[PDB]
Design a protein around this ligand. Structure first.
Ligand code: CLA
Ligand code: CLA
Ligand code: CLA
Ligand code: CLA
Ligand code: CLA
Ligand code: CLA
Ligand code: CLA
Ligand code: CLA
Ligand code: CLA
Ligand SMILES: CC1=C(C/C=C(\C)CCC[C@H](C)CCC[C@H](C)CCCC(C)C)C(=O)c2ccccc2C1=O
Ligand code: SF4
Ligand code: SF4
Lengths: 107, 67, 143, 734, 35, 41, 80, 165
């Protein structure tokens, strides 16, 4: 599956640049990006980002641009939801782009 | 007793407590207890903390004027 | 309260079938908890170890393996029907310990008869740094 | 209860759970948290542990020498260092099949062997080892040294031999001795060995212990040294047409300044390295008697620390009080040592590939790639360890009343400004690097690649033109003879260095383009972000706004619960464990850049890297897909080539990566409830409830879960990249 | 000096089967050691 | 009217208006100035 | 087991005891607060460290603090 | 001719890339009749490509060994070789626009705080006030440095929310 299915295919996706299928390659890269970006919400927690937001609050308070609405880190349930949503979207769009580019170029 | 043990009610105060969420922040005095408790100064704050509350009790030595 | 009540194993259990999340081998190796209440009528309640049971009109006795289950049942009975139950802890050798109503007035009240222990008389944030208490076995919050 | 396995923790002994095992292993060498532990006992345990680690290191290198001598081809590689590959160790696996045994017979061996990529063959050829008997006696001597060190640790652990507290706290004498003896006379003896052995062995003369005290290293015979005519040593250097194994084109020179590379072997000259180590030894000895010992002369650390305070309140109290802070807190010294050693091995990685010190090392591409990757990963790991132990210092042993108004109190006072500025520069670098990469990918996708933004790295090109590279043109120093830098040293090291730097074949100051510029900015983003995470963990270690009392909860605590909105991953340990991910990504970036640039250089298609590293389709396709064709074909239904083990461990690394995802995504409640259901299943079954567990099975701790996920993640990362790198560099080269 | 040819046939099963087995046996007795 | 105006005065609606305004401005600039890279008056 | 420490900033609002799922805290008479109540932990050996009392504390920072360490059968919430 | 690079007009790989792009556009164009909308679309694409390739040349852009133009970022070097319009002028323009955004946001933050429930004004924007501050931000650096001069741009460390040490 690693070589005769994933490496034997997906050559159409990576060689689609300069053709009408290049949007599939761009969407493939963006899907890889979103799938990777989901992992910071899937991992980690809330206190780290809360203290980072506190430091940014200090920075905006030095410049007197602190918002009236207090910025807070995402909730643990909210962070899990964001992580699973971005993870699912990244994986789904990765498979979508790879499948469509492979089945359009050689099909 | 004489005068009052704390500041004037309704006046702005600055919290000097370092471990409080409202350190170096301006709050409004709601009421000051006169029985002699440790933290009689009830201060209401415009911005809530992470727990969602906006009122806290502070002692006499941790409140100053708004600068 | 004025006199600590003694549990009665002969009190009837509430009408229930078989429980899967019931007492494990820890019940016959370590302590297990037993909750008693006084139902004025028969009604259906939800156990924390499974589905639903029906309590009998009279004394009712239930057994659990965790104190959290006993207090969850106690607060469910207090919030739903105002039952005021009480649970004991029975060890492997048969020693019975009174757990929830230590003064018989519930911990929400005061009763002016409990001595406050494990109370630090300094404000939080005034504790010493861990460098001050090093190689001594005493935590900064334990002083 | 109260088992005897955690003898260093009475509280952990009274834990009727499997976690007592796990916490009995992770807290094994944290002696500061052990019950009834004094500072003297902690120092003695540290000394014994240091002797144990030294013994393990010496045993490991003795085993490397023995497994190169036995079941190796050191002599055959000495005869022909170009064609035949080094052998690491023979393979005896009964699970191997006959085609697998036949396919692994390489390098003229009688059995299955592993091609060595550690580079000890080149190093031992450079230092003068030629025969297998020399490797045998070196291995047995190092085994004796390791046994001696283990016995020394045991004896210094024994009573009436344990050192005093003031002996360990004597910072001045330790500093003077380790600066003068551990670095000075060690380097002096090393360069003496170099002059006595390696230069004659590189000039076809055998120098051994049997003929020692008989062969003069220089024909003059030490008289220019006493006469002050040290220039007589640099009289007859080795010619350009010099063979390393033979005496053809040899000379009589032991210390010189012949900057550049040996043309035959593409490595630094042995005389140059001997002169370098001699100068380093002299500089270390002349600086190794500066601190105040029991004699009347020297320098006091505390006096210089307290006197160096800027006037007019520039740094407040200044550097006062830092002497007791360093001496009392061992984690501060640990962080400083780990940071310095990490910078050292980072410099080692960045200077080996550009300046190969070992003979026939640049030709061995897989060896150089593996060495650079290993050194960079170790460097990142101990960078993170330095920062983590600095956070440990800030949590455990840091008294603000002692160092009040000093530099530490100041940087703790405005920690928000530092964290905010690092966050801003991280956001800036990441936003612009990702925007540039996505812009280039979109532009190349639309069929018109000329619209992409290629910012020419003029700063590094200007530096390299200022250091001798004439490819970029310009008229700065070391390119124009009218410059004073060109005139100075015109007949000392410039003619060799300019020839070495004007050649495009070697890795000395390679051509840097816009793709190199973009990946360099990506590296800067990774370093700045990891620095931001680590200094936010260290500065907010003892307190924050969400947790002012973070010092009372120790260094590694899970959370404070769901209160105040949620407090998970708030300890400095969690900040370190996220910085491990960011460090892994950064080292992956630097190793991807190194591997792709060097692979395109070795293949001769440097233009492919120049026009392909701009956009991430080139990174995914021309590097991660084109070079992985030989890796994935290690084993197939058609057959098997020599890269079957690399494909297997590549899939192994991807699997351990997935298990890391398992231990990082899912958290404790689901597994605890599942363990409870399994406990009921084991309790209520016939023919299996007769047995029982001595300790109650419980789910792993949240900190433990983070550690296990981090370990699986890093193991999978390392194994996957090592497999890909070695299979791509060795499957098409040699 | 040079080890015999049967050394890979003996030391590898010893450190792959026998030595880890006795190590796990000692560790299992040490974990469950009670007073 | 004023209730609908305050609904339009909410943050997502004015953010949407800014989004269409900026996107249309950049798109019309790119259309009437096809593919520029360097500022050359 | 775990360590439950209660400071003088408590106002005697009895929210921590109501939020406690294992009956660890209690209310004792006091004179340092308007409500004349002070939180106590006479049953800290039964506390598991769930930090439910810290969620219900209305004062800034925390008038009650739970420190984990030396987990036992009762502290690990084990029915087996 | 800096950094060992040639101008795009003088380069050969630039012309080769332009020829290859024109060749593939003509290959795509030859599959359609001249009286069809795809023919006009491809002709417009070819005209845009030719105009872009002409505009990239004779503008100071230079390319090295691949025909892809390169940008010089160091000021002074870009000033003495007419490469300032590559990044130097656009970076100043982006700084001007970013300061416009920052000044407008700062003015809206300050001007919506001296009223009851400032979070309500934050969540429901005062559209006439927002547009007025939008059209009053054309002199952002003057007002910014004047606020720096009078000290109202920065807050003192006594009124600033600060984390415990
Ligand atoms: C000729 C005039 C002169 C000058 C130029 C200096 C200048 C200096 N002296 Mg000084 N000195 C002078 C006269 C002078 N002195 C006199 C007359 C005396 C009396 C004999 C001294 C005695 C003296 C002592 C005893 C010491 C100094 C030191 C210093 C240095 C630190 C000063 C300070 O407080 O930090 C500057 C002020 C600050 C508030 C520091 C801010 C630092 C920021 C926050 C760091 C920002 C980092 C940032 C991220 C970098 C980004 C770059 C990116 C690439 C990473 C500084 C270089 C100290 C030293 O050796 O340090 C090198 C020191 O120990 N001086
Ligand atoms: C490859 C995946 C990936 C990416 C892109 C990021 C991106 C980021 N993380 Mg990281 N992170 C990841 C994985 C990733 N993370 C993982 C797996 C871990 C381990 C758990 C971490 C751990 C971690 C820590 C510990 C920290 C970060 C931080 C950051 C920021 C760094 C600042 C920067 O570079 O500028 C931003 C660069 C980016 C690429 C961000 C993406 C923004 C792009 C441009 C999209 C923006 C929206 C776009 C216009 C589309 C709009 C429409 C759309 C929303 C529908 C940034 C938000 C730091 C932080 O918060 O900064 C202060 C920080 O402290 N992360
Ligand atoms: C000079 C080197 C040095 C020294 C002397 C120490 C010493 C110490 N550190 Mg430090 N540390 C170092 C380097 C060092 N560390 C580095 C490089 C890192 C970064 C990775 C860290 C990160 C670090 C953290 C984050 C913590 C410590 C802690 C500790 C203490 C616990 C050690 C102990 O007895 O438990 C012995 C510990 C173990 C036996 C656990 C090791 C388990 C490892 C990870 C498994 C190996 C991975 C993998 C499975 C191997 C198999 C691979 C597979 C392919 C086969 C001790 C004071 C802890 C502390 O002070 O407690 C509060 C702590 O929290 N250190
Ligand atoms: C000139 C005399 C001298 C020399 C050569 C050494 C050499 C050494 N000492 Mg040192 N030491 C000395 C005097 C000396 N000591 C004195 C006088 C004291 C007391 C004040 C100490 C106190 C001391 C401590 C407390 C420790 C050492 C350790 C070490 C070892 C460091 C590991 C190493 O080799 O790094 C290799 C470096 C490069 C290859 C570069 C090394 C064998 C450490 C140890 O036990 O071994 C790890 C250790 O923990 N030393
Ligand atoms: C089903 C999908 C899938 C998944 C999830 C994985 C998972 C993994 N693979 Mg595998 N892979 C797969 C299929 C898959 N593989 C297939 C089918 C092939 C073809 C044979 C490969 C080929 C392959 C190679 C060749 C390598 C991996 C690696 C990895 C690891 C990722 C390392 C990481 O997290 O670093 C995070 C990612 C990075 C640090 C870089 C990402 C790659 C970019 C495009 C390079 C360009 C970066 C550059 C600096 C510019 C970007 C800057 C930024 C600011 C924009 C992980 C074990 C790598 C590994 O073992 O660890 C290094 C590795 O070397 N895989
Ligand atoms: C590193 C140590 C080590 C060593 C030396 C061996 C040795 C062996 N294993 Mg292996 N094995 C190991 C670790 C090891 N194993 C591990 C860690 C796993 C789990 C991943 C396995 C899983 C495994 C399987 C699944 C099988 C083997 C089998 C075998 C045998 C190969 C077939 C053969 O010659 O017939 C055996 C000939 C003999 C003379 C042995 C009989 C005498 C015994 C010792 C009494 C051989 C004795 C095969 C086997 O034994 O077939 C039944 C087999 O099917 N192994
Ligand atoms: C952050 C990095 C970055 C940078 C510096 C640029 C810069 C540029 N790109 Mg790129 N781009 C980026 C990210 C970036 N983009 C990303 C992330 C994508 C994917 C969504 C794209 C997709 C993209 C395409 C598809 C195109 C560009 C184009 C352009 C040009 C701007 C044209 C424009 O807006 O009209 C100019 C508008 C103004 C000057 C506004 C003036 C407003 C007032 C008057 C001031 C310029 C060379 C176009 C171009 O000409 O190519 C060279 C083009 O065709 N880019
Ligand atoms: C810190 C970032 C940085 C770096 C690395 C460079 C690097 C360079 N600049 Mg530049 N420069 C910079 C910022 C920078 N510049 C800034 C902010 C300005 C003011 C706008 C200038 C103004 C400037 C001028 C006016 C000149 C250089 C020149 C040079 C070159 C030689 C400099 C030298 O001392 O000889 C070199 C490529 C010179 C050049 O082009 O080479 C002769 C030159 O004449 N620079
Ligand atoms: C207009 C309001 C405003 C202002 C003046 C600032 C100013 C600042 N921020 Mg902040 N920021 C803002 C909004 C603002 N921010 C918002 C909405 C967010 C959430 C996304 C952030 C998130 C943020 C982080 C995470 C960081 C900063 C940092 C900074 C500093 C660096 C300057 C910069 O460009 O950072 C970059 C800022 C951004 C990329 C945020 C841009 C957000 C959008 C695109 C702008 C919104 C404009 C707004 C709609 C205008 C309203 C006008 C009104 C009439 C409707 C500076 C003190 C950094 C710092 O601490 O430096 C010391 C830092 O690390 N900010
Ligand atoms: C990063 C991170 C955060 C911090 C993330 C936050 C505060 C959310 C930030 C959302 C932003 C504000 C969305 C909008 C981003 C852009 C400003 C909008 C698009 C701009 C373009 C159109 C220009 C958490 O709070 C968190 C919580 C629990 C688990 C994991 C995590 C986690 O990983
Ligand atoms: S680490 Fe777990 S128990 Fe702690 S706050 Fe986060 S989700 Fe809750
Ligand atoms: S919740 Fe807090 S303030 Fe209320 S009674 Fe408990 S400790 Fe006191």
């Amino acid at each position: 599956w690693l070589r005769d299915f994933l490496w034997a295919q997906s050559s159409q996706v990576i060689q689609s640049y300069g053709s009408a299928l290049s949007a599939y390659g761009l969407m493939f890269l963006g899907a890889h990006f979103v799938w990777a970006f989901s992992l910071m919400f899937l991992f980690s927690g809330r206190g780290y980002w809360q203290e980072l937001i506190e430091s940014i609050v200090w920075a905006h308070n030095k410049l007197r641009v602190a918002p009236s609405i207090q910025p807070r880190a995402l909730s643990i349930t909210q962070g899990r939801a964001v992580g699973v949503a971005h993870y699912l979207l990244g994986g789904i769009a990765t498979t979508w782009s790879f499948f469509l580019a492979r089945i359009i170029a050689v099909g | 007793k004489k005068k009052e043990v704390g500041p004037k009610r309704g006046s702005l105060v600055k919290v000097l407590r370092p471990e409080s969420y409202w350190y170096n922040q301006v709050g409004k005095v709601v009421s000051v207890d006169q029985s002699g408790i440790r933290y009689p100064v009830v201060v209401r704050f415009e911005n809530q903390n992470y727990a969602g509350v906006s009122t806290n009790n502070y002692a006499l030595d941790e409140v100053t004027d708004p600068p | 309260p004025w006199k600590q009540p003694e549990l009665d194993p002969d009190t009837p259990s509430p009408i229930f079938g078989g429980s899967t999340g019931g007492l494990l081998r820890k019940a016959q190796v370590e302590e297990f908890y037993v909750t008693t209440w006084e139902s004025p009528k028969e009604q259906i309640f939800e156990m924390p170890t499974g589905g639903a049971a029906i309590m009998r009109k009279g004394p009712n006795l239930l057994k659990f393996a965790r104190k959290e289950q006993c207090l969850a049942l106690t607060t469910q009975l207090r919030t739903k029907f105002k039952m005021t139950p009480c649970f004991y802890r029975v060890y492997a050798d048969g020693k019975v310990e009174y757990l929830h109503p230590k003064d018989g007035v519930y911990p929400e009240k005061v009763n002016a008869g409990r001595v406050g222990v494990n109370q630090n008389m300094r404000s939080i944030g005034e504790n010493v740094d861990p460098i001050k208490v090093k190689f001594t076995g005493s935590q900064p919050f334990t002083i | 209860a109260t088992k005897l396995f955690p003898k260093f923790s009475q509280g952990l002994a009274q834990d009727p759970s499997t976690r007592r095992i796990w916490y009995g292993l992770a807290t094994a060498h944290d002696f500061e948290s052990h019950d009834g532990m004094t500072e003297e006992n902690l120092y003695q345990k540290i000394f014994a542990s240091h002797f144990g680690q030294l013994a393990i290191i010496f045993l490991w290198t003795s085993g490397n020498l023995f497994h190169v001598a036995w079941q190796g081809n050191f002599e055959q590689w000495v005869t022909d260092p170009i064609h035949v590959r080094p052998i690491a160790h023979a393979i005896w696996d009964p699970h191997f099949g006959q085609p697998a045994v036949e396919a692994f017979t390489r390098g003229g061996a009688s059995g299955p062997v592993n091609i060595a990529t550690s580079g000890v063959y080149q190093w031992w050829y450079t230092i003068g080892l030629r025969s297998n008997q020399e490797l045998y006696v070196s291995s047995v001597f190092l085994a004796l040294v390791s046994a001696v060190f283990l016995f020394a640790g045991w004896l210094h652990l024994q009573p009436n031999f344990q050192p005093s507290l003031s002996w360990f706290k004597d910072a001045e004498s330790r500093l003077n001795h380790h600066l003068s003896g551990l670095f000075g006379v060690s380097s002096l003896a090393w360069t003496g060995h170099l002059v006595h052995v390696a230069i004659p062995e590189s000039r076809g003369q055998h120098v051994g212990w049997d003929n020692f005290l008989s062969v003069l290293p220089h024909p003059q015979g030490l008289t220019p040294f006493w006469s002050g005519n040290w220039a007589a040593y640099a009289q007859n250097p080795d010619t350009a047409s010099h063979a390393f194994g033979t005496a053809d084109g040899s000379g009589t020179a032991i210390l010189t300044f012949l900057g550049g590379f040996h043309p035959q072997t593409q490595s630094l000259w042995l005389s140059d390295m001997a002169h370098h180590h001699l100068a380093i030894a002299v500089l270390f000895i002349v600086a190794g008697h500066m601190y105040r010992t029991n004699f009347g002369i020297g320098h006091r650390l505390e006096a210089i620390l307290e006197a160096h305070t800027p006037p007019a309140g520039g740094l407040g109290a200044g550097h006062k009080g830092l002497f007791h802070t360093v001496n009392n807190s061992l984690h501060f010294q640990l962080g400083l040592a780990l940071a310095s050693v990490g910078t050292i091995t980072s410099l080692v990685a960045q200077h080996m590939y550009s300046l190969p010190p070992y003979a026939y090392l640049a030709v061995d591409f897989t060896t150089q790639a593996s060495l650079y990757t290993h050194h960079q990963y170790i460097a990142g790991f101990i960078m993170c360890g330095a920062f983590a132990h600095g956070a440990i210092f800030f949590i455990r042993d840091y008294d603000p009343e002692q160092n009040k108004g000093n530099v530490l109190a100041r940087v703790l006072d405005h920690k928000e400004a530092i964290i905010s500025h690092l966050s801003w520069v991280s956001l800036f670098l990441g936003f612009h690097t990702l925007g540039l990469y996505v812009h280039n990918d979109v532009v190349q996708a639309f069929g018109t690649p000329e619209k992409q933004i290629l910012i020419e790295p003029v700063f590094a090109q200007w530096i390299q033109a200022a250091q001798g590279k004439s490819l970029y043109g310009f008229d700065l120093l070391l390119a124009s003879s009218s410059s004073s830098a060109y005139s100075a040293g015109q007949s000392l090291w410039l003619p060799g260095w300019l020839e070495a730097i004007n050649n495009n074949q070697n890795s000395l100051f390679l051509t840097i383009g816009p793709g190199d510029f973009l990946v360099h900015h990506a590296i800067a983003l990774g370093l700045h972000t990891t620095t931001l995470i680590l200094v936010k963990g260290a500065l907010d270690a003892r307190g924050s706004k969400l947790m002012p009392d973070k010092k009372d909860f120790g260094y590694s605590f899970p959370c404070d619960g769901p209160g105040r909105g949620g407090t998970c991953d708030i300890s400095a340990y969690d900040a370190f464990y996220l910085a491990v991910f960011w460090m892994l990504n950064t080292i992956g970036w630097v190793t991807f850049y190194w591997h792709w640039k060097h692979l395109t250089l070795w293949q001769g298609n440097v233009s492919q890297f120049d026009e392909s590293s701009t956009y991430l389709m080139g990174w995914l396709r021309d590097y991660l897909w084109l070079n992985s064709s030989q890796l994935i074909n290690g084993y197939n239904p058609f057959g098997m080539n020599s890269l079957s083990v690399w494909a297997w461990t590549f899939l192994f690394g991807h699997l351990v990566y997935a298990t890391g995802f398992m231990f990082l995504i899912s958290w404790r409640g689901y597994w605890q409830e599942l363990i409870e259901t399994l406990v009921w299943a084991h309790e209520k079954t016939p023919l299996a409830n007769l047995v029982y567990w001595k300790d109650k099975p419980v789910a792993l701790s949240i900190v433990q879960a983070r550690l296990v996920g981090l370990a699986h993640f890093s193991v999978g990362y390392i194994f996957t990249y090592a497999a890909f790198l070695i299979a791509s560099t060795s499957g098409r080269f040699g | 000096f040079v080890p015999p040819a049967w050394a890979p046939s003996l030391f590898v099963p010893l450190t792959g089967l026998v030595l880890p087995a006795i190590g796990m046996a000692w560790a299992f007795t040490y974990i469950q050691k009670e007073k | 009217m004023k209730d609908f105006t305050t609904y339009l005065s909410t943050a997502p609606v004015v953010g949407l208006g800014w989004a269409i305004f900026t996107s249309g401005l950049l798109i019309e600039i790119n259309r009437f100035f096809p593919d520029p890279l360097v500022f050359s008056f | 087991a775990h360590v439950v420490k209660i400071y003088d900033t408590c106002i005697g609002c009895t929210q921590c005891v109501r939020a406690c799922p294992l009956d660890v805290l209690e209310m004792v008479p006091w004179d340092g607060c308007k409500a004349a109540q002070m939180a106590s932990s006479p049953r800290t050996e039964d506390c598991v460290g769930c930090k439910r009392c810290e969620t219900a504390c209305p004062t800034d920072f925390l008038s009650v603090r739970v420190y984990l360490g030396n987990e036992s059968t009762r502290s690990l919430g084990l029915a087996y | 001719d800096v950094a060992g690079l040639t101008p795009c007009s003088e380069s050969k790989a630039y012309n080769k890339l332009e020829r290859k792009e024109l060749k593939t556009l003509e290959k795509r164009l030859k599959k359609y009749e001249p009286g069809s909308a795809p023919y006009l679309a491809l002709q417009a694409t070819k005209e845009r490509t030719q105009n872009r390739f002409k505009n990239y040349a004779k503008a100071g852009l230079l390319c090295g060994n691949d025909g892809l133009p390169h940008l010089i970022s160091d000021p002074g070097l870009a000033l003495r070789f007419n490469h300032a319009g590559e990044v130097f002028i656009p970076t100043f323009g982006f700084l001007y626009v970013a300061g416009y955004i920052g000044h407008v946001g700062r003015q809206y933050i300050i001007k919506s705080k001296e009223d009851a429930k400032p979070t309500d004004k934050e969540i429901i924007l005062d559209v006439p006030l927002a547009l007025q501050l939008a059209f009053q931000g054309w002199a952002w650096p003057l007002a910014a440095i004047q606020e720096l001069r009078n000290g109202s741009l920065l807050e003192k460390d006594e009124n600033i929310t600060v984390s415990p040490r």
